[PDB]
Scaffold this motif. Sequence first.
Motif, PDB file in Angstrom:
ATOM      1  N   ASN A 100       0.844  -1.188   0.000  1.00  0.00           N
ATOM      2  CA  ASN A 100       0.000   0.000   0.000  1.00  0.00           C
ATOM      3  C   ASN A 100       0.876   1.234   0.000  1.00  0.00           C
ATOM      4  O   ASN A 100       2.033   1.169   0.368  1.00  0.00           O
ATOM      5  CB  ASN A 100      -0.924  -0.017   1.221  1.00  0.00           C
ATOM      6  CG  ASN A 100      -1.863  -1.196   1.205  1.00  0.00           C
ATOM      7  OD1 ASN A 100      -2.663  -1.353   0.280  1.00  0.00           O
ATOM      8  ND2 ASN A 100      -1.767  -2.047   2.233  1.00  0.00           N
ATOM      9  N   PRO A 101       0.327   2.381  -0.431  1.00  0.00           N
ATOM     10  CA  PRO A 101       1.193   3.562  -0.478  1.00  0.00           C
ATOM     11  C   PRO A 101       1.798   3.938   0.880  1.00  0.00           C
ATOM     12  O   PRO A 101       2.882   4.516   0.898  1.00  0.00           O
ATOM     13  CB  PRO A 101       0.256   4.669  -0.991  1.00  0.00           C
ATOM     14  CG  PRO A 101      -0.867   3.953  -1.665  1.00  0.00           C
ATOM     15  CD  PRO A 101      -1.039   2.662  -0.900  1.00  0.00           C
ATOM     16  N   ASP A 102       1.134   3.620   1.993  1.00  0.00           N
ATOM     17  CA  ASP A 102       1.673   3.972   3.312  1.00  0.00           C
ATOM     18  C   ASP A 102       2.764   3.002   3.807  1.00  0.00           C
ATOM     19  O   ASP A 102       3.257   3.119   4.930  1.00  0.00           O
ATOM     20  CB  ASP A 102       0.551   4.081   4.352  1.00  0.00           C
ATOM     21  CG  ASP A 102      -0.098   2.739   4.664  1.00  0.00           C
ATOM     22  OD1 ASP A 102       0.325   1.722   4.085  1.00  0.00           O
ATOM     23  OD2 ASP A 102      -1.036   2.699   5.487  1.00  0.00           O
TER      24      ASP A 102
HETATM   25 CL   LIG Z   1      -2.006   3.440   2.083  1.00  0.00          CL
END
Ligand SMILES: [Cl-]
Length: 124
Positions: A100-102
């Motif tokens: 995920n982007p995080d």
């Molecule tokens: Cl994310």
Amino acid sequence: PVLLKSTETGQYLRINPDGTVDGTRDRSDVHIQFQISPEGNGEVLLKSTETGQYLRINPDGTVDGTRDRSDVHIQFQISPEGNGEVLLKSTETGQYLRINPDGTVDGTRDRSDVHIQFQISPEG
Ligand SMILES: [Cl-]
Ligand SMILES: [Cl-]
């Protein structure tokens, strides 16, 4: 060894010694190195070079590392997606690995999710 890089976010998969799994853009971390090994005739295991842990996707969608060679959730199939991209699917649960982007890593059954595309590259 090889590296496993999310095409969408440019983050590399990492297994930490504490068993957690996440994504990093730090190309210098020795923990982003994997060995792909055959499991039987159709599957593979994804193993951390430096820690010896195998990637596991649990039924609940969480992703961690284990040294339990008997665990049924460490077997993957690599499917070509194009171009030069692959998906990494856990045979037991039908979930695809996602970064995920995080920076968190988890599993999803949504084949259309853009965050499940990987490119496999030799390290050096
Ligand atoms: Cl994310
Ligand atoms: Cl750690």
